[PDB]
Design an enzyme around this catalytic site. Structure first.
Site, short mmCIF file in Angstrom:
data_model
loop_
_atom_site.label_atom_id
_atom_site.label_comp_id
_atom_site.label_asym_id
_atom_site.label_seq_id
_atom_site.Cartn_x
_atom_site.Cartn_y
_atom_site.Cartn_z
N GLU A 791 -46.73 -72.08 31.78
CA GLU A 791 -46.34 -71.98 33.02
C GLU A 791 -46.79 -73.15 33.68
O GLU A 791 -47.53 -73.09 34.75
CB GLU A 791 -46.76 -70.67 33.66
CG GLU A 791 -46.21 -69.45 33.08
CD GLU A 791 -44.69 -69.35 33.71
OE1 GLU A 791 -44.24 -69.91 34.67
OE2 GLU A 791 -43.97 -68.23 33.41
N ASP A 792 -46.39 -74.25 33.14
CA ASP A 792 -46.84 -75.77 33.98
C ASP A 792 -48.23 -76.07 33.68
O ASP A 792 -48.75 -76.98 34.27
CB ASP A 792 -46.38 -75.79 35.23
CG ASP A 792 -44.97 -75.50 35.27
OD1 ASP A 792 -44.10 -75.61 34.40
OD2 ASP A 792 -44.59 -75.14 36.48
N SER A 793 -49.33 -75.46 32.82
CA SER A 793 -50.44 -75.75 32.91
C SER A 793 -50.35 -76.72 31.83
O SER A 793 -49.64 -77.12 31.05
CB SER A 793 -51.49 -74.53 32.29
OG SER A 793 -51.86 -73.55 33.50
N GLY A 943 -48.38 -80.34 36.97
CA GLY A 943 -49.03 -79.19 36.52
C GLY A 943 -50.53 -79.10 36.64
O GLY A 943 -51.13 -80.32 36.69
N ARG A 975 -35.69 -77.64 32.71
CA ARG A 975 -35.75 -78.77 33.95
C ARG A 975 -34.87 -79.81 33.46
O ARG A 975 -34.42 -80.57 34.19
CB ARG A 975 -37.17 -78.98 33.93
CG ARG A 975 -38.22 -77.99 34.42
CD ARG A 975 -39.36 -78.39 35.08
NE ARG A 975 -40.43 -77.75 34.36
CZ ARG A 975 -41.01 -76.79 34.95
NH1 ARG A 975 -40.36 -76.05 35.93
NH2 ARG A 975 -41.99 -75.97 34.46
#
Ligand SMILES: [Zn+2]
Ligand SMILES: [Zn+2]
Ligand SMILES: [Zn+2]
Ligand SMILES: [Zn+2]
Lengths: 1179, 69, 116
Positions: A791-793, A943, A975
DNA sequence: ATATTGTGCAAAATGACAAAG
RNA sequence: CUAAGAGUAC
DNA sequence: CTTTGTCATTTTGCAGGTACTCTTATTCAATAT
């Protein structure tokens, strides 16, 4: 090369671009507009009006004093000096910007004007016309009228002619571009304000319910006059099905929509045939005549010019004109209020009638479905007011105020017979304070946000801020990216918030015209055959092209092709100013010329027949490129060849959106000019199958703005990702200026080791990005390593952090003055003592020495005092337990921020304009990346750090290389950031080979070639590498995409956002927690949080949140009247409600203090919210 | 600002190769790749460490010292 | 409709009934100029309008560089080159038929099929 | 020398106004 | 302290 | 003669939720005690 006249290649155009950016720079529009304002607009403002005449009549009771005096004051030339500063001691010396910034001064220069005071006298003989003569007192004597702030690097600034070494001596960064003002030590930039152009007829269809179907309007305005806006509207009453379709015009200062024919007869056109000829230019166009018959049937009752003038005057809203003078009144309205942009003089009634006929013709064309209603979003119909015009209108208002004050003072002193003094007449504070207020606060007057604090977080941030346009916010759709925005504003650079689309950024090569006098062009037109409008009869010249200059129909031409050819030739050789735009609409038979200011234009290559090669070709050849290359190399002996040389020789042209309607542009020269087995890896392109080009794009990549020009491979990304990166690169952390060590900015962030990108665009070496980079090349692996990058970490290498990856310096400056509360109530910088000071802060004062300032080098933590200041008060007061007459001083110290800490970098002591001492303390700290800090690639892949692993725990390749960052694969597919992958591959190749990857958008660089080069270096062609798990050393079943990638450290760090509050300061009014983490505030428990708690059904928790956690107030009420008007003495145990006269019918209730305040505000507003503790009705 | 002491990824000391790198680029007219190979930078982590560095300290050195002794 | 104006005061002329000859007669409303009516038509109203589709054609329409070119037959010159554009009547329900101007003879010919 | 006073929906409500008894 | 404005994060 | 429904005006109240930072400014000037 060897051939001088050989055609250029797509690679050659960058030389041209370099020349442009050598002559123009990045902020050319700001400096150009300000220089235009200072050089010409000030003098015009001064000369317009500003002749105060006061005719003191004789007022002779006896003929012995029958002399009438006339005192006039006139203003001559205006002189603007170099910026200088006054002083407390009175000494005046030159002021340099890196003194104004440090001392909170204003980089302003005085204005002087030559005032000529004339006086005339006449013999007051009744009946005889007065003749005035001089008394020989022609006194003249420059006087100081105020200070104009000077934008840096402008023609009137000290830095305009400075060389690099001089700039270094003056403590000025040579990379600094100027284009901003220094107001009270703050850098202020004027955002270009977008508006609709004036003197343009626009026709719009109206909604169905309204009785008017079409409205043709012009927002007439005159630049060289009072600059007043008069909106004329021509409206067509009746829907399509209606029968009485009558056209009515809305004249200014008139309460009714006069029929058009009445206006035409008033101007002097009596016969119906002549009016119809003025309106309709074709006899065969019987549809327009049929639609126009109702108007003449309406105005049949008036058949005389005087009658029509009387009709208009009767409708006059002034209602202060006698019956006979109504005619004159109407005449005045038709001369000075109807179509002001044409003329304010008389004898031009024919011109105004022709213009009105033209407007009616446009309206009827729109109503006859022959043309679509005018697009409100067409960018050629817009203008950008830059610093020039904004300061122009502001100074016009302010100087009008000052001259009104002068006239009032003169009248007062002559009436009271007191002496006259210029120094007491002129109040320079008017102009000075007005300009300083308008620039210091955004509000532009006496609009908002017109002037903004210049953004100095990053060099690209400053560049983007200096080229920003704002559109104040009809039935249009302004947020959309219009077709006409091509090449003038960035297709993808705009805030994601409410401003999306409204706030725009200029393209790299886009410029704003500063405006020129149209008289020479009018003379050219008159000489070359333009028939004057006065003797123009449409029937004898049916196929005649109407020539417009700045929206003023000046006449007609019978051979427009030759006229356009010669005008183009004149503009191409420099005889006409290149900013002038000339459009020829063949279908509408019109020729428009625009020279006014605010028009946005871009340069383009010129294409001509070139009969020698037998086909169209660019006018520019290899010889000009060679000369430009020679000049550039010499700069880094031959005749200088600059962008202006290309402009003068007719090689490049300036085109705005309006002229861009009437041209054909080739995208690239090498592929579209020459007449007509392909690489499958290259993208598909179409030849357009058309050879009539008039211009060629210098380079398509120039359609992007400053922030978008940093993106590598922007054409391989989804457009919202480009927009996100454009917004997010301004938050990138880099080196904003090279002289950051001598500037006391409020906040500054610097990378330890900025690195230029491995994948770099050609346009970013004009933006100095390689000199002032804002990121680092981190080794990135795209892998699902541990699940801590979901989740974009991101997973950052701890060992890389230990060695200096993305480390930063942070400087914060606290300013403090000592102010004169009275004539001898000066504040004092000192080390306050608990013995004789009040309200000393709970922090430690031990780090201050005896001047009240910490000395650079000392470590400071949160709440420690860094500036010690005290203010005198009135002594001889006793309270608080430990307040005595000794406590004559109240503490006014400045503690360090509660959360922040660091080393005091520097402290600066000086005096202000008033002469009072003040200080600036700059504290330095180091920001090391940690879990929660935000980082982003150049493709909108933002992120935060999820976790950090040391090197031994990271996955490694066979060569021992470990990633600096690991990002999740799942960020890629949805994306569609293909450019991220391509840039990683290109960066790997470039790092291996030592070259620099050319990641320009519209080049013929393919993933196939990059893969082949990578394979030649001995790696898998697609960037995959066999990695090994760090924990066990076993091979990972899947191969990992691995390579360098350019990442930015963003300004959002978790340590600036973490905040918690058990109990703290409460707001004084509502007794609720204060707002903001800077104030130890509380979190808002909004309405919909309450709704979620209701849906959960937890009533007790909701009550606890709203009462015990925020504000619980116990109040007393009585059982007779439910009001809180109970006097309660708790210690004496006595309760009593006056009025009800009771002492045992009292109750106490726990209600929110905001509720008690609400009930008291209801009572104060004559409402009785009686509260009762028992039911009087059944449910 | 100034050449980093060690490569971020692997930790190889590259702070002593900046002057040699510039000397190779200028005096010997080698292209960047060959100079990097000559200095012993074989992994592309070290190669990007030295290749992409921007030496801003030179600019900082142009301003006159604040505290001059 | 072919409206006509008075030749005495340049004002509009309006239709009038005649009794002696039972004929239409155009008269002036302010100076009483009288003449015969060329045609019995006195009013026309186009619900579906065909004119205006080819409006704006000029002898130098070929000098426009924005207009697209074609090599279709000119049925007066048999020349290839010509310029072409769609109907100029901006009604939303107009057909997409193309019109062509020969740059040599300036003959306007359409790409319609039912008409031909 | 300083204190004091000269914006765009869209529903609801309302008013004007040609037809009806 | 209060107020207004601007920029910004999700 | 007064309804009567009917349109065309007038009001008129609203316009996501949290959160962060910074900057300026607090009526100008003339008069009288
Ligand atoms: Zn009571
Ligand atoms: Zn390394
Ligand atoms: Zn007549
Ligand atoms: Zn032909």
């Amino acid at each position: 090369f060897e051939d001088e006249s050989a055609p250029i290649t797509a690679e050659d155009s960058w030389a041209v671009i370099s020349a442009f950016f050598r002559e123009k720079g990045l902020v050319s529009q700001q400096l150009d507009s300000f220089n235009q304002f200072v050089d010409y607009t000030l003098q015009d403002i001064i000369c317009e009006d500003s002749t105060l005449i006061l005719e003191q009549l004789a007022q002779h009771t006896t003929e012995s004093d029958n002399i009438s005096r006339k005192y006039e004051i006139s203003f001559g030339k205006i002189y603007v000096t170099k910026p200088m500063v006054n002083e407390s001691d009175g000494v005046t010396h030159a002021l340099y910007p890196q003194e104004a910034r440090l001392r909170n001064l204003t980089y302003s220069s005085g204005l002087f004007v030559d005032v000529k005071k004339r006086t005339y006298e006449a013999i007051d003989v009744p009946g005889r016309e007065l003749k005035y003569e001089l008394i020989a007192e022609e006194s003249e004597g420059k006087v100081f009228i105020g200070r104009l702030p000077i934008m840096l690097r402008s023609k009137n600034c000290y830095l305009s002619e400075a060389t690099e070494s001089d700039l270094y001596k003056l403590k000025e960064c040579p990379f600094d571009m100027g284009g901003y003002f220094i107001i009270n030590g703050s850098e202020k930039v004027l955002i270009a304000q977008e508006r609709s152009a004036g003197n343009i007829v626009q026709v719009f269809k109206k909604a169905a319910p309204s009785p008017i179907s079409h409205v043709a309007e012009i927002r007439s305005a005159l630049e060289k006059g009072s600059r007043f806006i008069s909106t004329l509207q021509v409206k067509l009453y009746g829907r399509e099905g209606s029968s009485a379709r009558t056209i009515k015009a809305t004249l200014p200062y008139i309460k009714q929509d006069i029929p058009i024919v009445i206006i035409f007869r008033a101007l002097g056109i009596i016969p119906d045939g002549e009016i119809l000829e003025h309106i309709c230019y074709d006899v065969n166009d019987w549809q327009m005549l049929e639609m126009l018959k109702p108007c003449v049937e309406d105005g049949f009752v008036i058949q005389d010019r005087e009658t029509a003038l009387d009709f208009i005057g009767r409708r006059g809203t002034a209602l202060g004109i006698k019956k006979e003078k109504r005619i004159q009144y109407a005449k005045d309205i038709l001369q000075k209020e109807f179509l002001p942009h044409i003329t304010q003089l008389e004898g031009f009634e024919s011109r105004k009638a022709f213009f009105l006929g033209y407007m009616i013709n446009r309206l009827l064309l729109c109503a006859l479905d022959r043309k679509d209603q005018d697009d409100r979003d067409h960018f050629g119909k817009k203008r950008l007011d830059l610093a020039g015009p904004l300061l122009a209108q502001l100074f016009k208002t302010l100087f009008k105020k000052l001259t009104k004050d002068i006239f009032r003072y003169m009248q007062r002193t002559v009436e009271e017979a007191h002496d006259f003094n210029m120094k007491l007449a002129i109040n320079a504070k008017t102009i000075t304070s007005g300009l300083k207020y308008a620039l210091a606060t955004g509000n532009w007057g006496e609009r908002a946000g017109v002037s903004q604090v210049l953004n100095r977080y990053t060099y690209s941030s400053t560049l983007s801020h200096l080229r920003r346009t704002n559109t104040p916010i009809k039935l249009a759709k302004p947020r959309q990216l219009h077709n006409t925005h091509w090449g003038l504003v960035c297709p993808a650079e705009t805030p994601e918030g409410q401003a999306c689309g409204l706030v725009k950024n200029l393209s790299l090569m886009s410029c704003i015209s500063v405006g020129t006098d149209p008289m020479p062009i009018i003379t050219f037109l008159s000489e070359w055959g333009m028939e004057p409008l006065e003797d123009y009869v449409p029937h004898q010249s049916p196929d005649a092209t109407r020539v417009f200059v700045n929206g003023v129909w000046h006449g007609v031409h019978r051979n427009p092709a030759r006229l356009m050819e010669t005008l183009r030739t004149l503009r191409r050789k420099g005889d006409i100013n290149p900013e002038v735009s000339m459009i020829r609409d063949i279908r509408e038979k019109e020729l428009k010329i625009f020279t006014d200011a605010g028009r946005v234009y871009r340069p383009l290559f010129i294409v001509e027949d070139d009969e020698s090669l037998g086909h169209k070709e660019l006018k520019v050849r290899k010889g000009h490129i060679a000369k430009l290359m020679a000049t550039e190399y010499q700069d880094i002996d031959v005749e200088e060849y600059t962008w202006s040389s290309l402009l003068n020789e007719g090689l490049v042209e300036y085109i705005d959106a309006e002229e861009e309607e009437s041209i054909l542009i080739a995208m690239q020269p090498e592929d579209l000019e020459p007449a007509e087995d392909v690489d499958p890896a290259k993208r598909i392109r179409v030849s357009h199958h058309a050879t009539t080009f008039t211009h060629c794009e210098i380079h398509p990549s120039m359609i992007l703005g400053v922030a978008a020009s940093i993106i590598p491979f922007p054409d391989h990304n989804q457009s919202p990702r480009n927009t996100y990166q454009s917004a997010m690169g301004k938050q990138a952390m880099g080196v904003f200026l090279t002289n950051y060590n001598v500037r006391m900015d409020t906040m500054a962030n610097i990378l330890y080791y900025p690195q230029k990108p491995l994948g770099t665009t050609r346009a970013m070496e004009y933006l100095k990005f390689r000199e002032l980079p804002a990121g680092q090349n981190a080794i990135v692996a795209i892998a699902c390593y541990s699940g801590y990058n979901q989740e974009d970490s991101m997973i950052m290498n701890q060992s890389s952090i230990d060695r200096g990856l993305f480390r930063s310096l942070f400087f914060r400056s606290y300013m403090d003055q000592e102010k004169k509360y009275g004539m001898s109530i000066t504040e004092t910088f000192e080390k306050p003592q608990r013995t004789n000071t009040l309200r000393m802060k709970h922090g430690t004062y031990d780090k201050l020495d005896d001047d009240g300032l910490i000395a650079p080098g000392v470590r400071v933590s949160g709440e420690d005092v860094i500036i010690g200041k005290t203010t005198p008060i009135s002594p001889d007061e006793e309270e608080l337990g430990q307040r005595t007459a000794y406590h004559s001083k109240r503490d006014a110290s400045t503690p360090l921020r509660s959360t922040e800490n660091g080393i005091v970098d520097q402290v600066l002591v000086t005096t202000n304009q008033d002469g009072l001492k003040f200080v600036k303390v700059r504290v330095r700290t180091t920001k090391i990346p940690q879990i929660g800090d935000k980082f982003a690639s150049r493709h909108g892949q933002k992120g935060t750090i999820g976790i950090t692993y040391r090197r031994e725990d990271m996955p490694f390749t066979a060569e021992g290389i470990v990633p600096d960052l690991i990002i999740n694969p799942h960020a890629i597919p949805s994306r569609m950031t293909v450019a991220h992958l391509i840039e990683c591959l290109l960066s790997k190749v470039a790092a291996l080979s030592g070259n620099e990857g050319d990641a320009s958008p519209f080049t013929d660089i393919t993933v196939e070639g990059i893969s082949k080069l990578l394979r030649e270096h001995g790696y898998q062609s697609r960037g995959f590498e066999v990695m090994y798990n760090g924990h066990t050393g076993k091979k990972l079943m899947a191969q990992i995409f691995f390579g360098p990638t350019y990442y930015q450290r963003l300004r959002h760090m978790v340590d600036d956002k973490i905040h918690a509050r058990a109990r703290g300061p409460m707001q004084v009014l509502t007794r609720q927690p204060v707002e903001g983490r800077s104030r130890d505030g509380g979190l808002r428990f909004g309405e919909m949080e309450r709704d979620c708690m209701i849906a959960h059904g937890a009533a007790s928790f909701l009550k606890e949140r709203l009462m015990e956690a925020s504000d619980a107030f116990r109040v007393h009420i009585c059982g007779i009247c439910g009001l809180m008007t109970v006097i309660a003495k708790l210690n004496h145990n006595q309760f009593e409600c006056k009025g009800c006269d009771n002492k045992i019918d009292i109750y106490q209730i726990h209600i929110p203090y905001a509720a008690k305040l609400l009930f008291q505000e209801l009572m104060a507003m004559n409402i009785t919210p009686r509260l009762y503790t028992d039911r009087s009705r059944d449910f | 600002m100034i050449v980093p002491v060690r490569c971020f990824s692997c930790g190889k000391v590259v702070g002593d190769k900046w002057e040699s790198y510039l000397n190779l680029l200028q005096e010997d007219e080698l292209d960047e790749g060959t100079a990097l190979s000559r200095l012993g930078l074989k992994r592309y982590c070290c190669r990007r460490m030295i290749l992409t560095h921007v030496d801003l300290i030179e600019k900082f050195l142009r301003y006159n010292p604040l505290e001059k002794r | 409709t072919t409206f006509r104006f008075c030749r005495d005061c340049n004002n509009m002329l309006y239709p009038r009934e005649d009794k002696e000859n039972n004929r239409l007669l155009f008269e002036c409303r302010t100076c009483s100029y009288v003449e015969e009516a060329g045609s019995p038509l006195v009013y026309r109203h186009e619900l579906i309008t065909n004119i205006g589709e080819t409006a704006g054609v000029v002898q130098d329409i070929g000098s426009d560089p924005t207009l697209p070119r074609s090599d279709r037959e000119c049925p007066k010159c048999h020349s290839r080159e010509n310029v072409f554009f769609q109907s100029q009547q901006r009604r939303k329900d107009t057909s997409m038929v193309l019109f062509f101007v020969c740059l040599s003879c300036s003959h306007i010919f359409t790409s319609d099929q039912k008409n031909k």
